[PDB]
Symmetry: C2
Subunit: 466 residues, 2 copies
Amino acid sequence: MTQQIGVIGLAVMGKNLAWNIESRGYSVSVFNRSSEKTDLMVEESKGKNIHPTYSLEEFVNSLEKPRKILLMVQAGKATDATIDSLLPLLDDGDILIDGGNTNYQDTIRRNKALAQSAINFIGMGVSGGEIGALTGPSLMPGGQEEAYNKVADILDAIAAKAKDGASCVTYIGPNGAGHYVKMVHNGIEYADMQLIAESYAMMKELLGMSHEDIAQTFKDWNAGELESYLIEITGDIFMKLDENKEALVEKILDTAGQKGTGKWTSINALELGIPLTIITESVFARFISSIKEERVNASKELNGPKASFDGDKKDFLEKIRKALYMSKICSYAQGFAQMRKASEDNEWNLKLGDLAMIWREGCIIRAQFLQKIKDAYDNNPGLQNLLLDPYFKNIVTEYQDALRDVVATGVQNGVPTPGFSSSINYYDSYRAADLPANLIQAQRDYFGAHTYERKDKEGVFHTQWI
Amino acid sequence: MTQQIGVIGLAVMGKNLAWNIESRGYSVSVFNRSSEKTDLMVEESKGKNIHPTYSLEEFVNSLEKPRKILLMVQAGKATDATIDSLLPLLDDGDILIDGGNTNYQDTIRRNKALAQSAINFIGMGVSGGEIGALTGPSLMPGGQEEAYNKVADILDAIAAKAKDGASCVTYIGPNGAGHYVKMVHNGIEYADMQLIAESYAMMKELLGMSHEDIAQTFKDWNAGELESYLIEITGDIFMKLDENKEALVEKILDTAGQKGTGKWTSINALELGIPLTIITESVFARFISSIKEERVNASKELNGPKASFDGDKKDFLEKIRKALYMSKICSYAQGFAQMRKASEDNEWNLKLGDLAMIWREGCIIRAQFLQKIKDAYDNNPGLQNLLLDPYFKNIVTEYQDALRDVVATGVQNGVPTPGFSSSINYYDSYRAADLPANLIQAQRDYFGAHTYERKDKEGVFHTQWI
């Protein structure tokens, strides 16, 4: 007569999560604003413990208490409108879980507002696409720790399982912490795709490789330290042919968009004073790709060198592999340094090792790589930068030669490598004891009397430079 | 008895602006929260038409109507607190001018709120430092056009004069357009200083040049197309010697900090979808310089190549000069693309040629370069990107080969060049008819079913890739 958990929002994401929950033995009530999707789901859920409802009151009244409601509603105003319609119906102690791709500052606001009405609110990042939601996604719940423990068994049952049996879910932290790390996950994802895109650009523009050999190269890399879901599907993408038996990827319009959510990772890093150069270059690279009409016109006006390579191709192909691996290391080092700073500012007490562990499966950035990040934070929780961990330090110390040659060869041949370039520039800046910022300080004291410090003595100084 | 204009805030910027206004023959009332700064100005204003007031009531009562009041108050809550205290004392039609370094969104809010009380509010960017404020700054007033025309003669009198006689002030646009333009100026300034720092880094760590030859190099560069205030003061800075006749700039702690406001330009570009790579890398470079202790520890664990150069050092110096000029062109091309986008989104109807015109003198980024930007827009008001202007296109299509040599040499020798690198990557991306973003679109369709467009056919497509 009463169901254990309810799901609001019966699009592809919400319906798959409801089926995921039901497949684990739980009874699920479902509701959608348009009853068209509810009637369809019953058509596809015969023999399953799915209880359809056609009103918010009947939905709320069909749930066990404390009520556990999963919100899979369109992000933004639509989520707030569903919340404000649920509040007069809920009782004290009920648990609301928002699983959309939400701005973490909205989760902070909703958590703070609903807490005043004795309502628990969990902002949960969900990664894995539509197939991940059905079989096992990576889950990043943040909010009241007490409320998470009431739904921990459910989230554990539906989450993806790593090879060691651990499910890809854990309590992230208070209020908006869960949606925050999901945002950083997307930013990290932007860099990974951009670094793969630059590897493909070098293979095509510089080495003149065909789509069959590009696919095999990515498959070969996927068998080693670079193994990841993104590298794996890239190998499949370069094997898909169209109707005329030609590579379909080469026919796709190269416009990535200007309205993605990856920019919010970069904006937050700028607010926190964190140098997130590689992800931000990846965001900007998507902006550049969207002005296709301007780029075509500019190509007829601004010339450049003719890309050519007269060395050993498979040896340079190995340098690109090493450049790709080291660049991702630098990119993750920046992303995890951002989360460390965000955790301190928001007092979230984030366990970054545990976060790397739940990204091993389920999510888009899943990679064998993430195991080494966990081990870095487990052998040194006070780690300030991943580049200092002995495993990553030994990799980048060796791989920098390949990254330097890949960047130098790309610049010399007119192939844009924004991710590779910012990675080596970050490595050379982070390891530099003395930077040319002393001249910037002198100029600021010159025209603005901003004063400066000295390595010589202590104190603050101001100088008449003329 | 009554004065023509009033100044609130008698710190160095407000005091010098009041003296600037008075020197043009206008009567000025002054007020400061702490009366001691007012009393010190009375001492230094003997024989000048400066009338000191010691309360907001006496201050407002000493001004002719419509009252013209210049606010030089600490940015942030200090400005709102002063405005809120002024509102009941003012009459309909009075004109408040905020000349601080204000977030343009605060100006938009204040302009909208004060317009409900029939009070005009001009947000005005002011650039030039202390010397500029006293003798002639660059002024960027935005707000009510009718209110600007009532104070235009005063602003025209005090503003810097360009070499053709034109004052470095003009009506930027409605509400916060003036403060927005000031923010972009500061972002451009960040990039100019970072590009000069990288040139210095190459000269010292790669070419092994002493401070005397570094100073002479910048003075020689200033005598050419790179003529700029920032390059001019850079030559003077390397001439400044301490007690032991050592370059004082070499003893300055290389920590630019994160307390600057350049990050706001980058954040705005990310919200607008504008590729502001060069300025943003300059902002991030200041962040990396601020973590000095971390960098000192990283320098003992992360090794890199030993820099060395055996070629002709005079020829490479000329390549650094060309790379610096082209990098400025790319940086300004990005910043003027940002202003064009902000004009469209905010309905400001900005005239970018007028902006380059008023930056020819007074401000910090003043350079002969800005006359060429003015010429570019006066020759073609519909110019879509500075890289397409005949003069600039002729420069970058030749200087690119010097920029490529400089970036490649810096990368191979471990000298970080984030400004030079993002410059050549922007040139190669903006001119690329085909970017590798097609693979990104295929990936997004693989794991997320985000659909894609095609180059040959038309419409929206979706593919099962396996």
